[PDB]
Write a protein that binds this ligand. Structure first.
Ligand SMILES: [Zn+2]
Length: 258
């Protein structure tokens, strides 16, 4: 029926409704740090999130998204391997049922507890919908989460999850600053890929940060209290909403550092 992460509608079933699932540039992938090519041509990333305007937090049934006002160049990303300006539209997470799994991308086969995705669309295309239909339409900044000390900047998000426990629920979420989710270093790996959830369009330039951010066990625990289901239905905890690594095929992963 509808896609999900369960035994009967999980990742291995997606190809039936979205044949692109078996395409040539699917994500996520395993980052082999020894074969990734350091490219001196890559420019530093430029993240300008000082004017970011968050609007709402929503449980869409597969994750929770924090949405931003993308009607103007308020929070943008440029530089790196990108040509042009990409606007931040939303960020969301993928996490596991246990601390040893949860991330989508892996580094030398190592899985992290969760993975943060900051989705941006190329302004040259006018709107998000047109952007996803282009090979260079989106830029997604991926950040790994490891369990350790608390991330102060993440607490506001954690505190509101109670109000959006089930599918379809949303709440006002203004004045949230995404800069508090960033690691200290901006070194990264990049390769051409796709969305990791249906429609799995191959329109993404992935920018995966080398440095993980630390979150406490109590923080990740609250992610695990969310529900895939809507209110009034049998409770199915939202955990392990991650897609396994896909084959790299004819792609090269480039690193911005040596
Ligand atoms: Zn994602």
């Amino acid at each position: 029926h509808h896609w999900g992460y369960g035994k009967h509608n999980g990742p291995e079933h997606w190809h039936k409704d979205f044949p692109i699932a078996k395409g040539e540039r699917q994500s996520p992938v395993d980052i082999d740090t020894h074969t990734a090519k350091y490219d001196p041509s890559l420019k530093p990333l430029s993240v300008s999130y000082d004017q970011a305007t968050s609007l709402r937090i929503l449980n869409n049934g597969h994750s929770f998204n924090v949405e931003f006002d993308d009607s103007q160049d308020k929070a943008v990303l440029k530089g790196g391997p990108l040509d042009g300006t990409y606007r931040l539209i939303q960020f969301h997470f993928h996490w596991g049922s246990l601390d040893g799994q949860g991330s989508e991308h892996t580094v030398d086969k190592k899985k992290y507890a969760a993975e943060l995705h900051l989705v941006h669309w190329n302004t040259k295309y006018g709107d998000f919908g047109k952007a996803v239909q282009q090979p260079d339409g989106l830029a997604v900044l991926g950040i790994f989460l490891k369990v350790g000390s608390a991330k102060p900047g993440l607490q506001k998000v954690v505190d509101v999850l109670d109000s959006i426990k089930t599918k379809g629920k949303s709440a006002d979420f203004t004045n949230f600053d995404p800069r508090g989710l960033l690691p200290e270093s901006l070194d990264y790996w990049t390769y051409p890929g796709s969305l990791t959830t249906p429609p799995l369009l191959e329109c993404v330039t992935w920018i995966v940060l080398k440095e993980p951010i630390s979150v406490s066990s109590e923080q990740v625990l609250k992610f695990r209290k969310l529900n895939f289901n809507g209110e009034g239905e049998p409770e199915e905890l939202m955990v392990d909403n991650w897609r396994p690594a896909q084959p790299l095929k004819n792609r090269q992963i480039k690193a911005s550092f040596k």
